[PDB]
Design a protein around this ligand. Structure first.
Ligand SMILES: Nc1ccn([C@H]2C[C@H](O)[C@@H](COP(=O)(O)NP(=O)(O)OP(=O)(O)O)O2)c(=O)n1
Ligand SMILES: [Mn+2]
Length: 427
DNA sequence: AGTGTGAG
DNA sequence: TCTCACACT
């Protein structure tokens, strides 16, 4: 049987990233219930990032800041920079590149979102083991590490138990077996302590991190002791960890597919999947998903961490909901121009920084009365980083979905507009 | 090429 | 009352 202990993978995840980005810049928000918001007027603005101090009051993402203040009257607020009538995120993107560059010193990273990356440390863990000759690993090398499932067997303060668990782990490590997977997880955990130290001292940002054998475990582990902590999930921890883990908490099972794992099969927790055969799971979810599910519930995944530190697409979008929808040709032309303009800005910066040019532009629009995020999506060529050409071209390739017989109106009204650069080529 | 899913 | 990765057809 193949064990899934072949690689060492980590998932680093910035803590309340936007909140942190504003908190480094405005010291007045430090160590304070605090949230980041976009578009100030409707209900104070929508909250997309919450200080941990603020979360103790109930404040969550996707809350109207006015409601947020009903839970947390001293909630402090930063607002996302607006430009061209639109939210602009350049500060967090640039903040992100700060972090990704420091991470890259240690291994190749797969940028996963603006604020989290997977790491393959399999080989860096190798090298460290040789240089370790054979000497053990003192717990002083893992000041923020938690070992999931420990302590076991025969202190009530949160970090007090963290030390006893970390002691049990080390106390049973076969330091001499260079091929021992648990040993390599330990060595990985040591590296990311360093990696995390370097991020904090060189940017001021704190994050969390999971260390395990694939990306799904690393991601689930990283959540286990947020914030400013890092968790090691061993192959051995999985049966217990998964015995009560709701299926929806495993990455890619949060949506409809995980919903049908529950009702079809009639279970609640990841561990309950081991009683099914692969052919059984393939019967229900296709041959890729059953294969993926039969392994995953035993803690096995092979989705590699790809070498990809830059986004694969540069994209701009704005919604125009309610009666703010767009019912005029000139109105439609003006927001495309705005969007194309930010696009042109960001594109030019890309071409200079990463020696690459986008060759294909995707324009997409939603109409009031539809209910899927995209009503429509059609592509067109992108030959010049020129805001006027692109906005012109984007029109042409959507003009004909104006149902209204009169020229200067747009029926039905547009409630979403989207420009996106893609199909990159080295430059 | 064009849609839907999942996620931050 | 945004963003961007990916699988499928
Ligand atoms: N639905 C979402 C999720 C995230 N974001 C943005 C703002 C978030 O600070 C940033 C990363 O979000 P996140 O990783 O889901 N959790 P965020 O760093 O607030 O804090 P933690 O929950 O990781 O502590 O993406 C967003 O704009 N809309
Ligand atoms: Mn985060």
């Amino acid at each position: 049987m193949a064990t899934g202990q072949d690689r060492v993978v980590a998932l680093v995840d910035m803590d309340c990233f936007f909140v942190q980005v504003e908190q480094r810049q405005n010291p007045h928000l430090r160590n304070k219930p605090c949230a980041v918001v976009q578009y100030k007027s409707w209900k104070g603005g929508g909250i997309i990032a919450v200080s941990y101090e603020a979360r103790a009051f109930g404040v969550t993402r996707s809350m109207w800041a006015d409601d947020a203040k009903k839970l947390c009257p001293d909630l402090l607020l930063a607002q996302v920079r607006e430009s061209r009538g639109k939210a602009n995120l350049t500060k967090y993107r640039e903040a992100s590149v700060e972090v990704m560059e420091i991470m890259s010193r240690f291994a190749v990273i797969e940028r996963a979102s603006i604020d989290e990356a997977y790491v393959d440390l399999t080989s860096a863990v190798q090298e460290r083991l040789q240089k370790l000759q054979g000497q053990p690993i003192s717990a002083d090398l893992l000041p923020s590490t938690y070992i999931e499932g420990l302590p076991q067997g025969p202190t009530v303060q949160k970090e007090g138990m963290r030390k006893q668990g970390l002691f049990q782990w080390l106390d049973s490590l076969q330091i001499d077996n260079l091929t021992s997977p648990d040993l390599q997880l330990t060595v990985g955990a040591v590296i990311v302590e360093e990696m995390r130290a370097a991020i904090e001292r060189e940017t001021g940002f704190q994050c969390s991190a999971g260390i395990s054998h694939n990306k799904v475990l690393a991601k689930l582990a990283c959540g286990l002791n947020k914030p400013n902590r890092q968790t090691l999930v061993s192959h051995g921890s999985v049966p217990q960890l998964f015995s009560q883990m709701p299926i929806r908490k495993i990455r890619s099972l949060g949506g409809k597919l995980g919903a049908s794992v529950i009702e079809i099969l009639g279970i609640e927790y990841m561990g309950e999947l081991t009683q099914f055969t692969e052919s059984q799971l393939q019967s229900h979810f296709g041959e890729k998903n059953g294969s993926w599910l039969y392994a995953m519930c035993r803690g096995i995944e092979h989705d590699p961490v790809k070498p990809r530190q830059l986004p694969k697409t540069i994209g701009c979008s704005k919604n125009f909901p309610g009666k703010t929808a767009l019912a005029t040709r000139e109105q439609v032309q003006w927001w495309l121009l705005q969007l194309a303009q930010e696009l042109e800005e960001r594109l030019t910066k890309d071409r200079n920084d990463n020696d690459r040019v986008a060759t294909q532009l995707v324009v997409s629009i939603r109409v009031q009365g539809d209910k899927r995020l995209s009503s429509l999506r059609r592509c067109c060529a992108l030959t010049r980083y020129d805001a006027h050409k692109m906005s012109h071209d984007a029109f042409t390739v959507i003009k004909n979905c104006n149902t209204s017989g009169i020229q200067t109106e747009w029926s039905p009204p547009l409630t979403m507009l989207f420009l996106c650069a893609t199909k990159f080529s080295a430059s």
